[PDB]
Short mmCIF file of C-alpha atoms and ligand atoms in Angstrom, two decimals:
data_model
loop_
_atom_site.label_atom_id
_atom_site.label_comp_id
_atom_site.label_asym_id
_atom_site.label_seq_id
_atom_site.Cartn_x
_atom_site.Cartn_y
_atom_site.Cartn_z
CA UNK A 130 -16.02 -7.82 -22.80
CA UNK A 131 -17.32 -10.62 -20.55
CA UNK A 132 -20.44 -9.77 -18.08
CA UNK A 133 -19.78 -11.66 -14.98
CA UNK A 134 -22.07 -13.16 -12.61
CA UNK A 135 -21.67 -14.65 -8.67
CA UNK A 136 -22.51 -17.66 -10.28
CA UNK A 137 -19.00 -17.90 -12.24
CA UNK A 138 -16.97 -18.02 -9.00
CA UNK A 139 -15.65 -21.22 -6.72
CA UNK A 140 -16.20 -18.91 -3.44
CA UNK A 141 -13.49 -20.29 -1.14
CA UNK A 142 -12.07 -18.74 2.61
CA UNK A 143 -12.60 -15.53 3.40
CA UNK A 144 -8.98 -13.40 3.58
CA UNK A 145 -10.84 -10.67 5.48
CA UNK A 146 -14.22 -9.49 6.51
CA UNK A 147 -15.52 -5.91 7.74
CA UNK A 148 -18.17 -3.67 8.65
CA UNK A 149 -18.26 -3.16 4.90
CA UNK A 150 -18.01 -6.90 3.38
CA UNK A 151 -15.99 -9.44 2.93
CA UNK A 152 -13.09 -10.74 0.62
CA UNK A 153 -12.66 -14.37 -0.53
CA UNK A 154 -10.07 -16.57 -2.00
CA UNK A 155 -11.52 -17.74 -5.19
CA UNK A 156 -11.07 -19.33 -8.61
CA UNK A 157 -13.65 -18.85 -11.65
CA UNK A 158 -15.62 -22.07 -12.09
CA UNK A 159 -14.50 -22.38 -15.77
CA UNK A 160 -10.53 -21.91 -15.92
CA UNK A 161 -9.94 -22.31 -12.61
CA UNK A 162 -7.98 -18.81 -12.32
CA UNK A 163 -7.18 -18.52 -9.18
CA UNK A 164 -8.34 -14.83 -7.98
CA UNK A 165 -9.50 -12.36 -4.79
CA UNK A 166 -13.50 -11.53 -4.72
CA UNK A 167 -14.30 -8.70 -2.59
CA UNK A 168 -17.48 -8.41 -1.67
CA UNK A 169 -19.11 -5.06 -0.68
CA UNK A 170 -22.19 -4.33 0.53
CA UNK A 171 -24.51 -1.70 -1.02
CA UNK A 172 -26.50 -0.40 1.64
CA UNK A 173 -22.75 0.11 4.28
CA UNK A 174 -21.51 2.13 0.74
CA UNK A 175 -24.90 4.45 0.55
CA UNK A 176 -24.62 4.66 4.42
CA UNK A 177 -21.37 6.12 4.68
CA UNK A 178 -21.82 8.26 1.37
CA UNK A 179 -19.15 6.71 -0.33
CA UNK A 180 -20.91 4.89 -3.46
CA UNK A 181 -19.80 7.69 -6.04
CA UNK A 182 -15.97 7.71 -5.27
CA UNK A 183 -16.06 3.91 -5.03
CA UNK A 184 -17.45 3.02 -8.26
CA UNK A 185 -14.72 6.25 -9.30
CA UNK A 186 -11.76 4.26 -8.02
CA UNK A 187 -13.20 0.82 -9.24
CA UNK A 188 -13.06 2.06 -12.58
CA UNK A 189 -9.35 4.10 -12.07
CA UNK A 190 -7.79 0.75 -10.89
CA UNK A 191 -9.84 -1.21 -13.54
CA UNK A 192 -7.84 0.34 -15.97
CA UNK A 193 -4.19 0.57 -14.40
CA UNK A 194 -2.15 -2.11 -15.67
CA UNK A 195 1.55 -2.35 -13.83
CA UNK A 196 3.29 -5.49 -12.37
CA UNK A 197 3.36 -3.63 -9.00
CA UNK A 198 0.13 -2.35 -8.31
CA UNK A 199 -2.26 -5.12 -7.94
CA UNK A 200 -4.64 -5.59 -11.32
CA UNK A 201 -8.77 -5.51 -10.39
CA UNK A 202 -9.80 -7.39 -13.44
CA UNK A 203 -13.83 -6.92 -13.48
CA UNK A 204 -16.34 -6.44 -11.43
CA UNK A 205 -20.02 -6.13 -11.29
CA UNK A 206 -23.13 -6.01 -8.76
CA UNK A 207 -26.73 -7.35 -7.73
CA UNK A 208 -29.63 -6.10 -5.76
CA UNK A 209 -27.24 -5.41 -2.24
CA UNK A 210 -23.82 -6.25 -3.30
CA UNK A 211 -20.96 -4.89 -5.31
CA UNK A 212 -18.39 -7.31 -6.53
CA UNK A 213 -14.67 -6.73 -7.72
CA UNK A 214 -12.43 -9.36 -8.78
CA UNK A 215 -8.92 -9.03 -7.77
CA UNK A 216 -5.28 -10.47 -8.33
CA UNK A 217 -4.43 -13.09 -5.86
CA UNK A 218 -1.12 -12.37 -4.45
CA UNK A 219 -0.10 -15.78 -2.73
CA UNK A 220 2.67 -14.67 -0.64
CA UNK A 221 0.68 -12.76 1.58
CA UNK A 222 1.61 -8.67 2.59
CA UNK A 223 4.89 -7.16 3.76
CA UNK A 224 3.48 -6.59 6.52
CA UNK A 225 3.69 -10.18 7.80
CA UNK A 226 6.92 -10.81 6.02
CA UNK A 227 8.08 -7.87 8.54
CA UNK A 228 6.97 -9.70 11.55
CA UNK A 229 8.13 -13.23 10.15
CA UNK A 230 12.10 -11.66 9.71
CA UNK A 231 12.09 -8.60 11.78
CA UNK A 232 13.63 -6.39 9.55
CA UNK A 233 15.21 -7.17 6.14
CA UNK A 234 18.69 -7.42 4.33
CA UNK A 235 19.73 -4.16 2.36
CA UNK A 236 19.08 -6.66 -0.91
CA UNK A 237 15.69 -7.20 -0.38
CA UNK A 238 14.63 -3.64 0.87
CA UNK A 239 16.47 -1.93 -2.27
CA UNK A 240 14.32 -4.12 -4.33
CA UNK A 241 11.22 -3.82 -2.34
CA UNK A 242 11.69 0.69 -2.50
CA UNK A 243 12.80 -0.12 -6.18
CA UNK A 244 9.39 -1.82 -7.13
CA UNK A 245 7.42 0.59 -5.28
CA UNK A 246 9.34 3.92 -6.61
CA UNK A 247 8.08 2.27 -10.25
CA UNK A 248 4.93 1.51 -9.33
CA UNK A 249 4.66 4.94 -7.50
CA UNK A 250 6.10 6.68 -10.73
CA UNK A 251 3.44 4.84 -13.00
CA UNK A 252 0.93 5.96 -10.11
CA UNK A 253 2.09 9.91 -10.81
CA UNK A 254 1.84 9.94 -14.73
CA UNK A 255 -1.88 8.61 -14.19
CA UNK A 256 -2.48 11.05 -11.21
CA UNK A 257 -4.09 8.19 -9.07
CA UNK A 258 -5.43 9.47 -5.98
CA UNK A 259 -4.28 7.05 -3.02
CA UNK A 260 -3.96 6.65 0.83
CA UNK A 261 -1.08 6.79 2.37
CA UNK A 262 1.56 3.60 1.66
CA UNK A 263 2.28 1.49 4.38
CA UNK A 264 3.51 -2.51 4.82
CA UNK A 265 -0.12 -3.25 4.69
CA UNK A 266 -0.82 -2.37 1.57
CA UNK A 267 1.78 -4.44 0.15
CA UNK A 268 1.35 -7.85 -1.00
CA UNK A 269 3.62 -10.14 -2.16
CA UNK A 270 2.91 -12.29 -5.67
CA UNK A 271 4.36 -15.45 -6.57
CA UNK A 272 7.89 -14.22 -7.66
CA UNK A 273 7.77 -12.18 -4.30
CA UNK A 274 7.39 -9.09 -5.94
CA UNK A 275 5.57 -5.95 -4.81
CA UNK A 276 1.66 -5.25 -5.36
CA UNK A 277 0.21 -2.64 -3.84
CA UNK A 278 -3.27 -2.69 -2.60
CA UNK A 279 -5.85 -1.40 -1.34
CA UNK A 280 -5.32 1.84 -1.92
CA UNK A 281 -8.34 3.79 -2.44
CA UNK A 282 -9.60 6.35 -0.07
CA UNK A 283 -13.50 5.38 -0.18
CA UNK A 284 -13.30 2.16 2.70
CA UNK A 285 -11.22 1.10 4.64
CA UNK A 286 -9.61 -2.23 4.79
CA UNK A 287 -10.34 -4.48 7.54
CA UNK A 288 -7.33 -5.54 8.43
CA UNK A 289 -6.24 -6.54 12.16
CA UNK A 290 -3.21 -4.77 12.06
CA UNK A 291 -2.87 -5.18 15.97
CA UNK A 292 0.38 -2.90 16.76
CA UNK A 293 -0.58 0.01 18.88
CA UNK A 294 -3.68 1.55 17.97
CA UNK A 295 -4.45 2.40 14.00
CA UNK A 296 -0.70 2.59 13.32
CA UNK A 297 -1.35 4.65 10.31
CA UNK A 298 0.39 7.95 12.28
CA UNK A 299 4.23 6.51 11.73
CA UNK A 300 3.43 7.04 7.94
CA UNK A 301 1.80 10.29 7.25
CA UNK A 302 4.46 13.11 6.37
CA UNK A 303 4.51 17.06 8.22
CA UNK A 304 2.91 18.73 5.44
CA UNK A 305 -0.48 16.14 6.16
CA UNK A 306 -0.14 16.09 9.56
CA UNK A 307 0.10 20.12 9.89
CA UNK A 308 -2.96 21.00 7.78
CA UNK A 309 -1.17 22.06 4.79
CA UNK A 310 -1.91 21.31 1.39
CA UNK A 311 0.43 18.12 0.28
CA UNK A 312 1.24 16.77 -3.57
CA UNK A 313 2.86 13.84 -4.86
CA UNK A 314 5.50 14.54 -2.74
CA UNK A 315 4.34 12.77 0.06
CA UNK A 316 5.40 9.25 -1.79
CA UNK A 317 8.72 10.50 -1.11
CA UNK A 318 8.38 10.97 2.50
CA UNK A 319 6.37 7.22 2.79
CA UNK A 320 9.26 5.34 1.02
CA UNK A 321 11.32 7.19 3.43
CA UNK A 322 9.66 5.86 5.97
CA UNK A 323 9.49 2.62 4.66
CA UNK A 324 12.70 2.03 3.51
CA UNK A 325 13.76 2.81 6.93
CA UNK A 326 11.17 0.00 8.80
CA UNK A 327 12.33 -2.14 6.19
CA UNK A 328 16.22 -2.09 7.58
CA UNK A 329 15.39 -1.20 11.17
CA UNK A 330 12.28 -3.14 11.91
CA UNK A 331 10.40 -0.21 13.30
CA UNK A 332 8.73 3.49 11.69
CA UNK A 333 11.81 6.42 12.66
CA UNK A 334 9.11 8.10 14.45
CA UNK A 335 7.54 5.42 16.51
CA UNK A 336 7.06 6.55 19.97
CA UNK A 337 5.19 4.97 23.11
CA UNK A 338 2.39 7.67 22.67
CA UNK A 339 0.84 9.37 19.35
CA UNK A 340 1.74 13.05 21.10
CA UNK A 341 5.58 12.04 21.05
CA UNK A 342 5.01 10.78 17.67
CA UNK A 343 3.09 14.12 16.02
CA UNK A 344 5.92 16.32 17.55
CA UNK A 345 8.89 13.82 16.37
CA UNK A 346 7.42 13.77 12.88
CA UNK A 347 7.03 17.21 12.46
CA UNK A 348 10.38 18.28 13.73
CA UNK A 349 12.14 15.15 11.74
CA UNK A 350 13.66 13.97 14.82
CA UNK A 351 14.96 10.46 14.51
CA UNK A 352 17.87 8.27 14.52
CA UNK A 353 19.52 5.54 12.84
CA UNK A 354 20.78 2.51 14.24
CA UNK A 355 24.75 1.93 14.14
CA UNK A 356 24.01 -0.94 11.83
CA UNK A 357 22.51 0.90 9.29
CA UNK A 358 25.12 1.68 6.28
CA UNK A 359 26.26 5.29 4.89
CA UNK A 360 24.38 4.50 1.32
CA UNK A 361 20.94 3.66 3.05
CA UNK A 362 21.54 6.33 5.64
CA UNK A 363 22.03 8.78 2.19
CA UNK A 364 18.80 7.96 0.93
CA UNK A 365 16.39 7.63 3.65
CA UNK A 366 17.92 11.47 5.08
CA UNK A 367 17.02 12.48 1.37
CA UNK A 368 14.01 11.12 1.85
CA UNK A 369 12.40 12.31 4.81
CA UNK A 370 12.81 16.20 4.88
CA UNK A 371 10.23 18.44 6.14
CA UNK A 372 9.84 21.00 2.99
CA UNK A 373 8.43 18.39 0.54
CA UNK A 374 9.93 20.65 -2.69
CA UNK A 375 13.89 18.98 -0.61
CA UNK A 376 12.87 15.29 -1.52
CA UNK A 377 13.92 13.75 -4.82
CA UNK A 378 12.50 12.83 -7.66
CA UNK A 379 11.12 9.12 -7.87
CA UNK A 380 13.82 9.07 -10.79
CA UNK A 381 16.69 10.13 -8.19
CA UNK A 382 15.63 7.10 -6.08
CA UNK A 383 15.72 4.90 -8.77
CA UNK A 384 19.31 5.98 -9.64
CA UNK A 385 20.70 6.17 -6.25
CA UNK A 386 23.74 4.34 -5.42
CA UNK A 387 22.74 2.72 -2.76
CA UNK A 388 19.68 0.86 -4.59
CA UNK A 389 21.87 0.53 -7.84
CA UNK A 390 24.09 -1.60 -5.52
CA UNK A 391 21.55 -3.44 -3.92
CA UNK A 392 18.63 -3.98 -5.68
CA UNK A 393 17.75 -7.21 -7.54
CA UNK A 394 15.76 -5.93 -9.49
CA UNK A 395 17.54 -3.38 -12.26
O1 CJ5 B 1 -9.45 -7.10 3.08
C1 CJ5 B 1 -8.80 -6.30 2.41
N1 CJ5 B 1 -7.39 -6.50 2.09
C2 CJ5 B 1 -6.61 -7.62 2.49
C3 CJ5 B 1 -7.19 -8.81 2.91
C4 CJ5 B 1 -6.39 -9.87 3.28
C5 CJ5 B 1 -5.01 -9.74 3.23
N2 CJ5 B 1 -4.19 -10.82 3.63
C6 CJ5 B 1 -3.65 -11.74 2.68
N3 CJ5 B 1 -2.94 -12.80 3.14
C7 CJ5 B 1 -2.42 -13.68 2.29
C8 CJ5 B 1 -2.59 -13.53 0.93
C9 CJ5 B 1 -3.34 -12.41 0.51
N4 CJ5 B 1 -3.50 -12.24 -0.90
C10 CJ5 B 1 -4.35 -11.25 -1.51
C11 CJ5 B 1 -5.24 -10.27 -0.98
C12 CJ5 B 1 -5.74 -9.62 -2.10
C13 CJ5 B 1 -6.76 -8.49 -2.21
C14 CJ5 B 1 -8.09 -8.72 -1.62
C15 CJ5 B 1 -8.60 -7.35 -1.23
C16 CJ5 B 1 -7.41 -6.42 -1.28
C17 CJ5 B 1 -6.24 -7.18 -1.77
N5 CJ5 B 1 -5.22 -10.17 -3.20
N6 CJ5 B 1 -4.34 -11.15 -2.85
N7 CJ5 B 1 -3.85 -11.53 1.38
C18 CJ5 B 1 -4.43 -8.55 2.81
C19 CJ5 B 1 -5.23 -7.49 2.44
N8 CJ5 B 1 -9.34 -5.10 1.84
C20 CJ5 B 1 -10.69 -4.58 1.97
C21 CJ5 B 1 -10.92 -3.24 1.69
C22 CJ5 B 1 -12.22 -2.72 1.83
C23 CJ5 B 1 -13.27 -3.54 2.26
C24 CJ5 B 1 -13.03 -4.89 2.55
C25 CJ5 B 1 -14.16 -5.79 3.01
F1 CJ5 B 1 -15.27 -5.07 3.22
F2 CJ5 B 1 -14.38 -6.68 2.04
F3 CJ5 B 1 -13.81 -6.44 4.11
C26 CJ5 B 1 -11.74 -5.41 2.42
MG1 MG B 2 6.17 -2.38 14.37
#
């Protein structure tokens, strides 16, 4: 097992920066591996009381290995920083891709909800604890496949998301939202939601102000577009129900017709 040092790394632009530290495109001196450095700072960690459950998830996610959950492949720390060195997904995050197209063919979103229902599934058998899924969390790699990122509940990504104001509300599922107690089933609700950006372009639930959005999420009030097909419409109205113990298994949305059809990826 290799002990690395700050020393190893070409440090090249930074791909975001934050209250908390900063992340760099990088390779390592030696090989030339092109990789992610996030940088965090020690004292922003002990101020915020979150040093314990970071260096928890560090090691969780050190030891994942799936192609659709990005790979953290060391880290380590001096006096004031904490390191971690990350897979470098060059085709940036759905998110983007979103805005670049505006909403995507029923090919590409099957494929996209098929790599995250795997990745999601992996994520269940290991019981990894994560934040709420949304286009920002995914990244793309070189064969355009899902990563997801960022995931961890102990800080916050720095991200300029722009739209609206924190933007996180359009994901979260009744059960959160109410002050219940939620389970895995909340994936099910989020790929819901997801799938249904992807095709659309916008969350079902968006809404001008936050108090139209709480009330439309928790009464599952939304609509489809005339555009979107009976198969997608199937799954998505599978997807988002209010009683959590209605939604499918991740295995159900692997096997569903409409992402048999579509998907790219079998
Ligand atoms: O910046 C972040 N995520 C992030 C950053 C940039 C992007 N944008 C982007 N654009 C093009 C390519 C690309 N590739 C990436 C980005 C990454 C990781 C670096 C950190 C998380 C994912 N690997 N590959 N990313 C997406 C997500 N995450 C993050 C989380 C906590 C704390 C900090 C900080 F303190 F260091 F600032 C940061
Ligand atoms: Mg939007």
């Amino acid at each position: 097992k290799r002990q690395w040092a700050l020393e190893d790394f070409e440090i090249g632009r930074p791909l975001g920066k934050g209250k908390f530290g900063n992340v760099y495109l990088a390779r390592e001196k030696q090989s030339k591996f092109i990789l992610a450095l996030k940088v965090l700072f020690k004292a922003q960690l002990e101020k915020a009381g979150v040093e314990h459950q970071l260096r928890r998830e560090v090691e969780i996610q050190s030891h994942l290995r799936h192609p659709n959950i990005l790979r953290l492949y060391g880290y380590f720390h001096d006096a004031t920083r904490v390191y971690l060195i990350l897979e470098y997904a060059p085709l940036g995050t759905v998110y983007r891709e979103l805005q670049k197209l505006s909403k995507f063919d029923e090919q590409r979103t099957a494929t996209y909800i098929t790599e995250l229902a795997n990745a999601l599934s992996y994520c269940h058998s290991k019981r990894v604890i994560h934040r709420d899924i949304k286009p920002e969390n995914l990244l793309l790699g070189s064969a355009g496949e899902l990563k997801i990122a960022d995931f961890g509940w102990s800080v916050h990504a720095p991200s300029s998301r722009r739209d609206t104001l924190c933007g996180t509300l359009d994901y979260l599922p009744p059960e959160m939202i109410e002050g219940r107690m939620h389970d895995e089933k909340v994936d099910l609700w989020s790929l819901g939601v997801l799938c249904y950006e992807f095709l659309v372009g916008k969350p079902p639930f968006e809404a001008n102000t936050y108090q139209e959005t709480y009330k439309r999420i928790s009464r599952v009030e939304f609509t489809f577009p005339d555009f979107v097909t009976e198969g997608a419409r199937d799954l998505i109205s599978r997807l988002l129900k209010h009683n959590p113990s209605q939604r499918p298994m991740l295995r159900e949305v692997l096997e569903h017709p409409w992402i048999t059809a579509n998907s790219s990826k079998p």
